[PDB]
Amino acid sequence: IQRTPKIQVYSRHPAENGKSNFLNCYVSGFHPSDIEVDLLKNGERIEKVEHSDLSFSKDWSFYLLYYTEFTPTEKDEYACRVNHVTLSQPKIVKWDRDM
């Protein structure tokens, strides 16, 4: 009855250190629709994170895009924290610039 979210963490543009960009967390393939998504900078929750309007795919599973403006560096670690009824603990997916 319930489906766990797929999670992708990525940037809008090719990542360049010192250049302004957008950090995306795409959650998809989940049911029910209730979901908690935060973007993290070095483990700390980023404020003013926006998201797309709730929609669903042909298989009825929901999807949402969470996003914020960010400037990537060499040492700053970015991640996406997702909580859903299907998960016993919040899932942390790190940002890999090659993914």
The residues binding another protein (CB under 8 A) are 1-3, 6, 8, 10, 12, 14, 22, 24, 26, 28-29, 31-34, 52-56, 60-62, 65, 67, 98
According to DSSP, residue 31 is labeled B
Nearer residue to another protein within complex by CB, 24 or 38:
24
For another protein, the closer of residues 43 and 46 by Cβ is 46
The Cα diameter of the chain in Å comes to 45
Tokens coding 51: 């998201």
Per-position b or e across 70-96, b if 16+ CB within 10 A of its CB: bebeeeeebbbbbebeeeeeebebebe
Shortest approach of another protein to residue 30 CB, angstroms?
10
Rounded to the nearest whole angstrom, what is the least distance from the CB of residue 40 to another protein in the complex? 18
